[PDB]
Amino acid sequence: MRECISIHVGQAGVQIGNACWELYCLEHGIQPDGQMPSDKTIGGGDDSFNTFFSETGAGKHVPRAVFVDLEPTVIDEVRTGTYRQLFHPEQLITGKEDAANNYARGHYTIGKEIIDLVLDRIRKLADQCTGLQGFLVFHSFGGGTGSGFTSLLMERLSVDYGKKSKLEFSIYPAPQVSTAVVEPYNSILTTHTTLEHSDCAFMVDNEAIYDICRRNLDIERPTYTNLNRLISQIVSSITASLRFDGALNVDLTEFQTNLVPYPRIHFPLATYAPVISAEKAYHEQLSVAEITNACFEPANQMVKCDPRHGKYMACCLLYRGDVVPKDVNAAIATIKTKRSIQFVDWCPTGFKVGINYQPPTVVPGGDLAKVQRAVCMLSNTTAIAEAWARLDHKFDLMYAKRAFVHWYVGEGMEEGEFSEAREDMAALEKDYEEVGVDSVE
Amino acid sequence: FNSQVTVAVRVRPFSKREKTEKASQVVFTNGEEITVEHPDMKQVYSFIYDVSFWSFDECHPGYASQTTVYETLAAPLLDRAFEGYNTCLFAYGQTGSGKSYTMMGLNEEPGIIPRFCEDLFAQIAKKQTSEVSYHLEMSFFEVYNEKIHDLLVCKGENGQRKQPLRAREHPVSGPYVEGLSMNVVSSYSDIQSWLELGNKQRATAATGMNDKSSRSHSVFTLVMTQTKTEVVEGEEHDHRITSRINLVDLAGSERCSTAHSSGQRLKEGVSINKSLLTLGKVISALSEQANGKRVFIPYRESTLTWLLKESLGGNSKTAMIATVSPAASNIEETLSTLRYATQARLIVNIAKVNEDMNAKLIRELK
Amino acid sequence: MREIVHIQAGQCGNQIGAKFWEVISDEHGIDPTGSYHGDSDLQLERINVYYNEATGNKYVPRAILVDLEPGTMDSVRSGPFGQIFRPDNFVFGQSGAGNNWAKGHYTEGAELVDSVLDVVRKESESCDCLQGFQLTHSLGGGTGSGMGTLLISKIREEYPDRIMNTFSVMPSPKVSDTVVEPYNATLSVHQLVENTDETYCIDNEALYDICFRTLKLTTPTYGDLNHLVSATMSGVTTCLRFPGQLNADLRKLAVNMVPFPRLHFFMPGFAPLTSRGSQQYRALTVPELTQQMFDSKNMMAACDPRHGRYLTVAAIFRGRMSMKEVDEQMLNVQNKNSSYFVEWIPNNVKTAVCDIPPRGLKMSATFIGNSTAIQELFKRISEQFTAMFRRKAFLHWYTGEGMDEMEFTEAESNMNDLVSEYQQYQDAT
Ligand SMILES: CC(=O)O[C@H]1C(=O)[C@@]2(C)[C@H]([C@H](OC(=O)c3ccccc3)[C@]3(O)C[C@H](OC(=O)[C@H](O)[C@@H](NC(=O)c4ccccc4)c4ccccc4)C(C)=C1C3(C)C)[C@]1(OC(C)=O)CO[C@@H]1C[C@@H]2O
Ligand SMILES: Nc1nc2c(ncn2[C@@H]2O[C@H](COP(=O)(O)OP(=O)(O)OP(=O)(O)O)[C@@H](O)[C@H]2O)c(=O)[nH]1
Ligand SMILES: Nc1ncnc2c1ncn2[C@@H]1O[C@H](COP(=O)(O)OP(=O)(O)NP(=O)(O)O)[C@@H](O)[C@H]1O
Ligand SMILES: Nc1nc2c(ncn2[C@@H]2O[C@H](COP(=O)(O)OP(=O)(O)O)[C@@H](O)[C@H]2O)c(=O)[nH]1
Ligand SMILES: [Mg+2]
Ligand SMILES: [Mg+2]
């Protein structure tokens, strides 16, 4: 069997973890109490899989996961909420204080006194992983914790284990929308480090998912309690292959390599088919061909990045429900047939595929309507660098006057560290230029 | 005299530490021009300075001892002091870069500070005449966690004898320390004894980067007044000049990732980095000012800058000395240091001589 | 949990404290006796933020009172909520300073500050995780200022890692209370800027116009103005005690608001107010709140932004809201009114949201701003100062207590410098 470790660090992750684990139960027919009256009904099946959940002789089941956010006010909601009787209570409410958007705190000063636990529960959880192991981490770039603690953590994990899949899911800081004014300092510092230990980090954004939440979901006033569910389903649509059967399954490690040409471009995007409200549950057939067009629609991308200002290095597509490979070859054919899409000359192959029979599910009280099938896309593209360009510009503008710097230094971060991380990011920016330029002879 | 600051540089060589953990060379001196090779061998940065020395090796031209460096850098400031100009020299750079080894040096190869001091005493000996009477005083103090302490005080006997002082701003002469026990100099011997006491009591400590680190900032002030005859048939010795010399030994970044430490250690390191950052901002705005830019100078964001205001700018003939390493282990630090310095050349202040013809009519006749 | 020590010093502060706890008690289901009679655990999950507990399920606040030179002492105690306060925390002396700062810093407060400081140490040690301090006072006066800055400094030395916040009624441009406010305050500012992480600059005049026009009250009192000050004091820390989609705390407020360590003075605001009639004549929306929030007439500091620009703000909302509309609305403001904002700060605003509204409102918000307009107040105090200083107009009263000209001079240089610093970034580039 295969297993994986879901970690949530900071606010954003945890709000997503609540969303994520809420879905998994439903997909597995498990009740909040860890029990299976559905198994009382069925009396069989491994639906409470070892992949994400453990089990006991009481009929309880426990997810393979953990969280920490240095904000007791968040977890406590969970600890008193509907799922308190589910999780292992040893959740790391260490929030004597928060990092307050300061990397130096969450990374160095007060990431101390905490991490030695975070690693330990991981081991206890790891020791039960008589299967594959690949990690799933949820953080937000720009936030103090989601960048500070995450950077510290993965560094050690690459040393405790190293030889493992360590895939992040994370919200990039938007170009315009922001809930803070020092995310840029915080983000760049992050990529200085996690670039090196990690192996992939799917990036998303709130602005786009907001826009999607408007246009197709027909929502006037969306909020966090809906975005997370879109972010959740993806993570399921990824991880399903480990759980159910499929005419064409896939491992985590397969994503590690087919999407990752060189060690330093392991930073792709994602889409889905959340284009379906209850009313427009009709008026469409929602085919394989139908959606596969939609996956590469600029609008339905999950970050603010025109593909058309760049090219596609590699893409992977994971389908669900009643989906036939024949259609996939057909729809994917047409996608190659269009010139709005520009690939490299490197990749005649271009595309990887994946299919699982197990359809999606739908959360009650939610938004997305039932659909007999669905698909996820990932893409490593040169286009993203414009987003990198926006950030490094912001960094330089204000850093020049050394604004907000004394706070980090007040926590022990040397000055030029910022410049060290900057020079790195320009290299990454150059790296994307390199790959993007066509070859000649 | 709207005039610039002399910026000098000294690449010290590598050490036992690099011998144990091999760290290649990347700094290279084209006689005096500084060039640094990225370990990636993707870029060579290069920097030009008014002065250079190549202490990396003793042999190739460009080499200079403490006193060669003196007569390059600090003896001219001695000259301007006897001309009557206030003067400054301050050090910059990381830990283990010989910043003290240069300014102060040790017993066997003392620094620019003691070289200048004996040169100053004997230079007064050159004119120990009734033509001009001379009177020299000096103070010596330290900065630790933004707290000011007196190096020339024999502490009392107690568990806590690090008596703090505080700063006050004379509306005219600027900042100064209360209780600062400025004492009279008869000679360089007296200077030496004072310096020995102070450097002994300085809050310094061993660590993982060096056996003994300057964990506090040190200031060494001299002021020489010289009363000369005026050009009148009456009271002739009614002219005087003063000259204030300021020699400063700062601290290094001491990045905690290598300077793994805890408690008071990390506290001192934090305060140090904060101070040096503030200084850097001061330096930068000063450069912009020298470019003609109308700019607010946060002298007041700390103590070091506040006290050194009239030296970092103001009215004085000044200089900086930057210490840098050859080991690629700290190439980032050396580059930061070199960039600090090469920016630093661009700085100017307006330097004159402190006659202080107050209640004299001399300046008015002039 | 994060814990705060609240301190009261001066006629103006203690009443603000007096009105303050009356609001917090209402926000936590507590009676004048200190018992619980609420209906939600939320009012108790984080009660230890402000209060300590006692034996019979009573709850004592972490309040301290230091200028109870007795004339206001009875005023507090013989009040609707006087009795909850720890009697031992009623520290005081006698022979009031007569608004002479030096008496309030050097002579009398010197004798008393030990005792109040000792009590602070107790409330500190009894905490599990101390975060920062919360002082109420006023400038211009003797006690609130001198004894304040004294007590502020000492605490900073003892807890330099910690936070020190104040909410300080500032002297007016026009309508004075005492005649030596330029003297009393500038001394304060000298010690305030250097020993503080942030302070909230409040002016009486703005509060008057605010209550006069928007609240449409023809007979407002000191009792009612405060009722607005206590609100902001509570909104700043709503995300501390209560949860939300996006949490905030004092430390998270500064680091996003304090780019340079000296520019830590602020212009708060609070929504919504409607004089009861128009309540039937609107509806509460996010753009609606935002509209009042950046209203040039809802600024309790009396420093018209429109002659200056903002460095950074914090718009703490409170209630059930959608974040899209929130983040969108700040952007619009950044867009349309961009000239009032800095270029070299790419985003000139942060946000924070708590999912628990107040007693009788569906949604509320709190404003925090850092702007260049604060220059103007600072010039006034300086200009008023010099006109008196050069003639030594009232000087002899302080010198009788041991101050000297340098000290008055020192602060002046410092205050002018703060101005120039703001003026540095005042021009668009
Ligand atoms: C009770 C009611 O349904 O009527 C409203 C009301 O008429 C209005 C106008 C209230 C009312 O405001 C005033 O009357 C007022 C008068 C002088 C000075 C300051 C306020 C109200 O008093 C204010 C009061 O608000 C609260 O209840 C909150 O607790 C508020 N503080 C208090 O009012 C309060 C004071 C003492 C004891 C208990 C509560 C608050 C402020 C900050 C943080 C938490 C709570 C509310 C809804 C109303 C009344 C009562 C009429 C308004 O204020 C608030 C906070 O609601 C004024 O504009 C708003 C809109 C409200 O609709
Ligand atoms: N999409 C989404 N984003 C969130 C959610 N919660 C927080 N965020 C993001 O998190 C960022 C704020 O910084 P965070 O990283 O959350 O801060 P933290 O993780 O609590 O740790 P601190 O930075 O110390 O607060 C913002 O950019 C938010 O968009 C959520 O539920 N959904
Ligand atoms: N160029 C050089 N040639 C020969 N010896 C040197 C040179 N530079 C430094 N040294 C010696 O090597 C040692 C390392 O210098 P060190 O004094 O630790 O730097 P530092 O000035 O103390 N930095 P800090 O402690 O941060 O102020 C000193 O004790 C010097 O004697
Ligand atoms: N908002 C408010 N301000 C007050 C109140 N009482 C006094 N003040 C202000 O506080 C100032 C008086 O200073 P005060 O602190 O009494 O002087 P001290 O106590 O002797 O230092 C005056 O400027 C008043 O306007 C009040 O109840 N509410
Ligand atoms: Mg957090
Ligand atoms: Mg040294």
Residue numbers in the entry:
A (entry chain A): 1 to 441
B (entry chain K): 0, 391 to 755
C (entry chain B): 1 to 429
Sentences from the study reporting this entry:
KIF14 is a microtubule-based motor protein with essential roles during cell division. As all kinesins, KIF14 possesses a highly conserved catalytic motor or head domain that contains nucleotide and microtubule binding sites, and where ATP hydrolysis is coupled to the generation of mechanical work. Here we report the near-atomic resolution structures of twenty KIF14-microtubule complexes corresponding to five distinct KIF14 constructs in four nucleotide conditions mimicking four key steps of the ATP hydrolysis cycle.
The longer K772 construct includes a full neck-linker and the first coiled coil domain CC1. The faster migration of K772 is consistent with this construct forming dimers in solution, as expected from the presence of a coiled coil domain. The other four datasets correspond to KIF14 dimers forming a two-heads-bound intermediate with each of the two heads in a distinct conformation (MT-K755-ANP, MT-K755-AAF, MT-K772-ANP, and MT-K772-AAF). Different from the Apo and ADP states in the AMP-PNP and ADP-AlFx states, the MT-K755 and MT-K772 helically averaged cryo-EM maps show a density connecting the motor domains along a protofilament. This density can be well-fitted with the undocked neck-linker of a motor domain positioned further toward the microtubule plus end (leading head) and part of the coiled coil domain connecting with a docked neck-linker of a motor domain positioned more toward the microtubule minus end (trailing head). The new maps with separated densities identify the leading head with the undocked backward pointing neck-linker as the one in the open conformation and the trailing head with a docked neck-linker as the one in the closed conformation. On the other hand, in the trailing head of the two-heads-bound structures, the neck-liker is partially unzipped as it separates from the core motor domain disrupting the interactions with KH7.
